[PDB]
Amino acid sequence: XXXXXXXXXXXPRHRAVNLFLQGYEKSWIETEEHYFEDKLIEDLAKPGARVDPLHQ
Amino acid sequence: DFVAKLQDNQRFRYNEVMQALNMSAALTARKTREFRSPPQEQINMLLNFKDDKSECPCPEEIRDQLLDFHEDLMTHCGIE
């Protein structure tokens, strides 16, 4: 049977710098590197002396 | 300067891995990047270190200088 089964089974220079700066601007700079969305609106509403700047 | 130090290092690692061949089933997977994967995604995949570790090649020395330059750019900008 094993014999039968076995019989059955047998049967150049500046392109690199350009691509580097492209990859850098693509995946290194816009990677969530700043926090201003609260300080900006906070100091934009202080009427230090009318109408507030954010109101304008 | 970064590309000058990166391209020659990539070519050097390619030549070294070609002299020390040790033909196996993984060498083809390692060297498909050289022929396939045009330079765009090549540079995309050889420039990625923001997490703890990725498949960055052997030139780890330039990673630190790139981090220093990036911090210099951040401090030149308004980022503290």
From Swiss-Prot, chain A:
UniProt PTM comment: Channel activity is modulated by phosphorylation. Phosphorylation is increased in failing heart, leading to calcium leaks and increased cytoplasmic Ca(2+) levels.
Effect of gene knockout: Embryonically lethal. Embryos die at about 10 dpc, due to defects in heart tube development. Cardiac myotubes display enlarged rough endoplasmic reticulum and cytoplasmic vesicles that contain high levels of Ca(2+).
Compartmental location: Sarcoplasmic reticulum membrane
Regions annotated as coiled coil: none
Tissue-by-tissue expression: Highly expressed in heart, lung, cerebellum and brain. Detected at lower levels in adrenal gland, stomach, thymus, esophagus and ovary.
Entry function: Cytosolic calcium-activated calcium channel that mediates the release of Ca(2+) from the sarcoplasmic reticulum into the cytosol and thereby plays a key role in triggering cardiac muscle contraction. Aberrant channel activation can lead to cardiac arrhythmia. In cardiac myocytes, calcium release is triggered by increased Ca(2+) cytosolic levels due to activation of the L-type calcium channel CACNA1C. The calcium channel activity is modulated by formation of heterotetramers with RYR3. Required for cellular calcium ion homeostasis. Required for embryonic heart development.
Subunit relationships: Homotetramer. Can also form heterotetramers with RYR1 and RYR3. Interacts with CALM and S100A1; these interactions regulate channel activity. Identified in a complex composed of RYR2, FKBP1B, PKA catalytic subunit, PRKAR2A, AKAP6, and the protein phosphatases PP2A and PP1. Interacts directly with FKBP1B, PKA, PP1 and PP2A. Interacts with FKBP1A and FKBP1B; these interactions may stabilize the channel in its closed state and prevent Ca(2+) leaks. Interacts with SELENON. Identified in a complex, composed of FSD2, CMYA5 and RYR2.
Family from the record: Belongs to the ryanodine receptor (TC 1.A.3.1) family. RYR2 subfamily.
Domain text: The calcium release channel activity resides in the C-terminal region while the remaining part of the protein resides in the cytoplasm.
This protein's name: Ryanodine receptor 2
Species annotation: Mus musculus
Gene it is expressed from: Ryr2
